[PDB]
């Protein structure tokens with residue numbers, strides 16, 4: 001999985017992402033790639049490198065494709081699929097798109113397929129959120145930065161995407177990714193509002209401890225809201241699987 005860094009040509013600076021700066025470039029003079037440069041001193045490097053190599057074997061149309069790494073230098077580079085329309089959160093917030101609700105539901109379908117695949121590999125994302133999803137030139141949404149929070153050494157914790165058992169007991173599971181997916185659906189249908197937008201993280205955790213929830217964005221139909229709401233059952237084991245959520249999303253697409 002080691003890419004020769006001399007096969008890379010850097011062409012545009014894209015800004016700072018989670019975990020470090022990202023550039024647009026070409027691999028072998030020809031093929032578009034993104035290059036993420038891991039901030040020095042930020043990662044448990046040996047762990048990160050061993051898992052990166054494992055994660056290289058994950059492949060799905062709706063996961064941002066990992067191509068390779070450059071680890072014989074510092075900073076470490078990660079070479080991935082280039083997603084021309086950038087972060088989903090920013091894309092949602094661009095009012096110029098004038099999105100139809102069918103487009104919003106398709107964004108949810110895209111993410112749900114990626115998550116069903118990760119679930120089928122028993123691999124948790126751990127920080128699923130619109131900020132971490134990316135959009136390609138065809139408007140397809142793909143999931144990225146899965147698993148990576150595990151290597152960050154060591155105000156940043158995803159309180160607003162976490163279920164009660166995480167906030168109270170640090171109980172992480174497939175069902176905490178389910179919860180997060182529901183919040184992501186809310187982000188999509190709210191055109192990128194911050195969840196609990198007028199609450200602090202502290203206030204959010206307290207509201208969640210009291211059993212209270214996000215409510216229906218204006219653009220979410222009753223059927224769509226029912227799906228996102230199902231991700232927030234108090235009891236983790238009554239929350240659906242990604243396979244069930246996908247089937248529910250497909251049914252709505254076929255109806256609405």
Ligand SMILES: CC1(C(=O)N2CCC[C@@H](c3nc(-c4ccc(C(=O)Nc5cc(C(F)(F)F)ccn5)cc4)c4c(N)nccn34)C2)COC1
Nearest residue numbers: 015016017022034036052078082083086087090144145146
């Ligand atoms: C300018 C804005 C933006 O679009 N951003 C933030 C700056 C970075 C931008 C960005 N970030 C990325 C990006 C690149 C690489 C990774 C990555 O390394 N993911 C990864 C790596 C691993 C591994 F273990 F291999 F390290 C695992 C999982 N996921 C993640 C995200 C990409 C991309 N692929 N195309 C285009 C743009 N990309 C997105 C912010 O508001 C719009």
Ligand SMILES: [Cl-]
Nearest residue numbers: 013014015021
């Ligand atoms: Cl940059």
